[PDB]
Amino acid sequence: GDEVRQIAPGQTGKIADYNYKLPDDFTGCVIAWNSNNLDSKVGGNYNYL
């Protein structure tokens, strides 16, 4: 969740720099929603790297 802000042009962080970088000339839309009731389990979900 705290990394959603990093999915934007001009941003830095472990995601903006290492896993998903956007162009500074980007045309399009960034859509995000929580998945706390799907992508998480008890004992935690360790399938997202």
Partner: protein
């Protein structure tokens, strides 16, 4: 208000443990901070709601 001086600011270390809810640079771009150095730095530290 802590004075920070005489050091190397990588901020890559923070990635392994810290996860910020907000990050915001006024003045300078978040991606230029590796390519920059500062005249003086003060860290104003406090807890809010």
């Amino acid at each position: 208000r802590k004075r920070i001086s005489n050091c190397v600011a990588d901020y890559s270390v923070l990635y392994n443990s810290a996860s910020f809810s907000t990050f915001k640079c006024y003045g300078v771009s978040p991606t230029k901070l590796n390519d920059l150095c500062f005249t003086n730095v003060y860290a104003d530290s406090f807890v809010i709601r």
